[PDB]
Design a protein around this ligand. Sequence first.
Ligand SMILES: C[NH+](C)c1cc(NC(=O)CNC(C)(C)C)c(O)c2c1C[C@H]1C[C@H]3[C@H]([NH+](C)C)C(O)=C(C(N)=O)C(=O)[C@@]3(O)C(O)=C1C2=O
Ligand SMILES: C[NH+](C)c1cc(NC(=O)CNC(C)(C)C)c(O)c2c1C[C@H]1C[C@H]3[C@H]([NH+](C)C)C(O)=C(C(N)=O)C(=O)[C@@]3(O)C(O)=C1C2=O
Ligand SMILES: C[NH+](C)c1cc(NC(=O)CNC(C)(C)C)c(O)c2c1C[C@H]1C[C@H]3[C@H]([NH+](C)C)C(O)=C(C(N)=O)C(=O)[C@@]3(O)C(O)=C1C2=O
Ligand SMILES: [Mg+2]
Ligand SMILES: [Mg+2]
Ligand SMILES: [Mg+2]
Ligand SMILES: [Mg+2]
Ligand SMILES: [Mg+2]
Ligand SMILES: [Mg+2]
Ligand SMILES: [Mg+2]
Ligand SMILES: [Mg+2]
Ligand SMILES: [Mg+2]
Ligand SMILES: [Mg+2]
Ligand SMILES: [Mg+2]
Ligand SMILES: [Mg+2]
Ligand SMILES: [Mg+2]
Ligand SMILES: [Mg+2]
Ligand SMILES: [Mg+2]
Ligand SMILES: [Mg+2]
Ligand SMILES: [Mg+2]
Ligand SMILES: [Mg+2]
Ligand SMILES: [Mg+2]
Ligand SMILES: [Mg+2]
Lengths: 137, 76, 96, 115, 57
Amino acid sequence: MLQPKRTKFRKVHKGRNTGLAHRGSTVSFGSIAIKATERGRMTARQIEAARRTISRRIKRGGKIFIRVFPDKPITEKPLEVRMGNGKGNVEYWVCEIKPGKILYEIEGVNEDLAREAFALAAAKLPFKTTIVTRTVM
Amino acid sequence: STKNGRDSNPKMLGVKVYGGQTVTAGNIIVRQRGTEFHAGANVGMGRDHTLFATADGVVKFEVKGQFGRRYVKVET
Amino acid sequence: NFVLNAQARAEDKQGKGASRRLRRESLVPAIIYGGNAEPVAVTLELRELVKALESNAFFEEVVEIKVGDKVENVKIQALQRHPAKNTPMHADFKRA
Amino acid sequence: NEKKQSRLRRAKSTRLHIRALGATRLCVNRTPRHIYAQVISADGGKVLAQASTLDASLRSGTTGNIEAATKVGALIAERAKAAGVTKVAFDRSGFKYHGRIKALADAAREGGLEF
Amino acid sequence: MKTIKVTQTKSSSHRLKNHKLCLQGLGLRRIGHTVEVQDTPSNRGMINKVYYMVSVE
RNA sequence: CGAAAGCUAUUUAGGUAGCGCCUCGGACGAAUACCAUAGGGGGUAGAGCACUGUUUCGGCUAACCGAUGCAAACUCCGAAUACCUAUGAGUACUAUCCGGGAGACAGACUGCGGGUGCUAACGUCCGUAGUCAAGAGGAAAACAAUCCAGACCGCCAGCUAAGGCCCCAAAAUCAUAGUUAAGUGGGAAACGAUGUGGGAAGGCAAGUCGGCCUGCGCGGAAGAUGUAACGGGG
RNA sequence: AGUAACGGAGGAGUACGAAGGUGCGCUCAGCGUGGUCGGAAAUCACGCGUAGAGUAUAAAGGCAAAAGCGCGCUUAACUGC
RNA sequence: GCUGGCGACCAUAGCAAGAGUGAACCACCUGAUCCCUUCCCGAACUCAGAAGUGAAACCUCUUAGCGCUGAUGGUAGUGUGGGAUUACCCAUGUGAGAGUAAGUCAUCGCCAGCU
Ligand SMILES: C[NH+](C)c1cc(NC(=O)CNC(C)(C)C)c(O)c2c1C[C@H]1C[C@H]3[C@H]([NH+](C)C)C(O)=C(C(N)=O)C(=O)[C@@]3(O)C(O)=C1C2=O
Ligand SMILES: C[NH+](C)c1cc(NC(=O)CNC(C)(C)C)c(O)c2c1C[C@H]1C[C@H]3[C@H]([NH+](C)C)C(O)=C(C(N)=O)C(=O)[C@@]3(O)C(O)=C1C2=O
Ligand SMILES: C[NH+](C)c1cc(NC(=O)CNC(C)(C)C)c(O)c2c1C[C@H]1C[C@H]3[C@H]([NH+](C)C)C(O)=C(C(N)=O)C(=O)[C@@]3(O)C(O)=C1C2=O
Ligand SMILES: [Mg+2]
Ligand SMILES: [Mg+2]
Ligand SMILES: [Mg+2]
Ligand SMILES: [Mg+2]
Ligand SMILES: [Mg+2]
Ligand SMILES: [Mg+2]
Ligand SMILES: [Mg+2]
Ligand SMILES: [Mg+2]
Ligand SMILES: [Mg+2]
Ligand SMILES: [Mg+2]
Ligand SMILES: [Mg+2]
Ligand SMILES: [Mg+2]
Ligand SMILES: [Mg+2]
Ligand SMILES: [Mg+2]
Ligand SMILES: [Mg+2]
Ligand SMILES: [Mg+2]
Ligand SMILES: [Mg+2]
Ligand SMILES: [Mg+2]
Ligand SMILES: [Mg+2]
Ligand SMILES: [Mg+2]
């Protein structure tokens, strides 16, 4: 599962996930893409699982472009500790997902096999997704 | 136990007199760490880069020079 | 050949709220500029435009807009799509 | 280029200080062939007086040495007193103060200019 | 000069401090109270701040 | 008339003291506030990748280049508000200053912006506004902190707010046009499905096929005294 | 402006008679190309050079009139304010 | 019409690429005896000059290739009121950044000299 090789800071504020994804919202690396129409978090484990189910299905024909990278560390308190005593320990990494974000792109595969692969990947993710095609403006 | 609990007292820096206000000689205009504002006419600078009015007049901020510096000056 | 039928979009139909009202009544704001005339703001019908958008000649041809007894020979310059739902939000047209 | 560029870098400090003092400036320029002096206002835009080795009184002779500089200094002192300019700040403009510049400045001090 | 009628239609009790000050500076005392003010930009600003609890002729 | 549960310090933390907030007396009276206009400085929201980091693909012999993301402790940018000053209209015993007397320094909830926590808690800690505290009345069945509204006393007078108008229980078994068949309304997810209404297209030709976008519904849906997840009847 | 938590990160309890004053002068870091060892990275020369170097010391804000780097003379690291 | 100096203004003014200027001026230039310089060096600074050359440099022209400027429209955000609670929606006010069309190979002042 993906992870930054290094970061400036270990722990990070929680923040608010708000707004739409106007940046990573266009098919730019391949011909078909899966796009999140709902908001949430995407752990690195989910990214690995969805990539595995897509790649095993399309059977190595065509390239897969992972367009999300998990760069936000998430902490957790150990079990049976009270509420003070500093911030919890890093457990896993997530990517914040705004509606409109491209998650995976497939290049070099026909539409039906890629749509099968994307349907298989959607059942591994915690938000609703859609299948979008590359257009010209 | 973690190792983060420290901070320093506030320093109360910033612009004290805004553009258009009247000043007398000796009135402090800007408390700043470096020179984010530079002294123009009728404005002096203290050892800690404090900008103060050396004359009566009204305060006026500008952007001048080829380095695009922010200048405070006092109009007499 | 493509022909789009438009209406004039005066101010009081411009800005955030009026644009959202337009898009609720199945309309698209658009703008026409280029040449030496001034920009003209127009309202297009969403179904007409999303049908023209399906074709590829629509992006390589000179299309025509009719604001009402006025021809306008333009080329599509920029599209703005809603990020989540792919519906077009606004269109740019360059006089041709 | 490099020489003029470095010399203007050398002049900037005195020029900015003279502007901050709000003083009438006696700016001098020196070329291998001529010498020039200008009495300039505190705002830096108006030339209150001037003198050079191009004056129909020094040109016909020889220019670019210490004697011509002394003559220019006397002439600029006179012309500056004629225009009611007494207290000035000397701007050597990145030139060393010794030499032809010093001859001009001494002739200007003896001419009546106060600095 | 060119007066207008302003009536208070809702309560001013739990509003923002400056909205209550706009009502007090217009001269309005209670719900249903009506005042006659000069039509000026200085008064139109106070009326526009509190458009939601006031009715204008 | 009318607070506060704040700040600073404290062998201090449930005490106390100065300041903040209340009241009384005196002085002085628009100096004050609200709004308009004018003049200012921001580095937040958003955005962006110019720096610091981080990140995907491709080219090139690692640097660079093209494309492509991200950031509390990144910034080439950059609001709304807020804050400061001047001038002005109108409306308000406003603002200052000098004295007497205090109380208070356990706060709570709701919204909005955050840290922490499990983007848990009627959790905790800040900022900001309102309410309670110290505030009754009407609504939310009941229900400090929600919504409407600020109770001087009296009246078998009228108009309204929130919220309501079949009966308990005051007022429409009111009107027009649609939708639902689930008592949905009147508790819940991923996901599943020729439910049913509407819209824009498309293919094939007695109409048929399957793709979308939507309105309202269905399943998913198991708990302990008794229906018991419309207050009830219905 | 201020603003809390057993919130997230780091420093201090010094140094310096010059590393203070002043006048005068100077401009880095990195790249390329050449050159005795010598070599990616020392010193020399030449071209660029986008501020990316430096700052007694942590970070931030500054820094070309450089606030960075040298040389001469000095004691204003003065007293009353 | 050209140079010189000092300013205003700080890229719509800049880079990159071409091109031209020696009457005067400016630059390079000749030599250092003298005044001054070099942690070595007349490179720089300084002085005494005028045999050359516009080569370099400066300056002036030309060019949108890159920079820089930059609308209109839309979008994001947001004050107030209201409605919902995963961050939206509605009314009203405000309104970016990015990107697009387009614009840019500066404008102005005081003084002196030469044509
Ligand atoms: C107006 N701009 C275009 C300009 C003009 C001149 N020229 C003059 O004033 C004198 N010569 C002229 C009048 C042009 C004939 C200029 O001389 C300059 C500049 C620009 C500045 C910019 C500087 C900038 N920083 C230090 C504020 C900067 O960061 C850079 C850079 N490349 O990054 C600079 O180059 C800059 O330092 C600089 O050198 C400028 C000028 O010298
Ligand atoms: C040191 N100064 C003389 C300078 C010179 C040049 N250019 C050169 O050295 C010219 N290069 C040659 C040798 C001629 C090839 C320079 O190019 C620069 C600068 C200054 C810096 C200043 C920077 C500054 N901050 C970041 C330290 C800053 O805040 C500004 C600003 N305007 O606010 C800058 O402009 C700055 O970032 C900057 O760009 C500089 C230069 O570019
Ligand atoms: C316009 N300014 C902001 C500017 C920008 C750039 N561009 C960059 O450095 C771009 N670099 C990136 C890629 C953005 C990092 C620039 O590169 C420059 C300059 C300034 C010029 C000024 C030139 C000037 N002219 C008259 C020759 C000049 O005389 C001086 C001077 N007297 O100092 C210069 O510095 C100048 O030659 C120069 O170097 C400039 C730039 O290089
Ligand atoms: Mg700066
Ligand atoms: Mg709105
Ligand atoms: Mg210096
Ligand atoms: Mg009372
Ligand atoms: Mg009193
Ligand atoms: Mg942000
Ligand atoms: Mg206490
Ligand atoms: Mg307490
Ligand atoms: Mg509290
Ligand atoms: Mg609590
Ligand atoms: Mg109590
Ligand atoms: Mg009550
Ligand atoms: Mg009640
Ligand atoms: Mg009740
Ligand atoms: Mg009634
Ligand atoms: Mg009844
Ligand atoms: Mg009926
Ligand atoms: Mg720069
Ligand atoms: Mg706009
Ligand atoms: Mg813009």
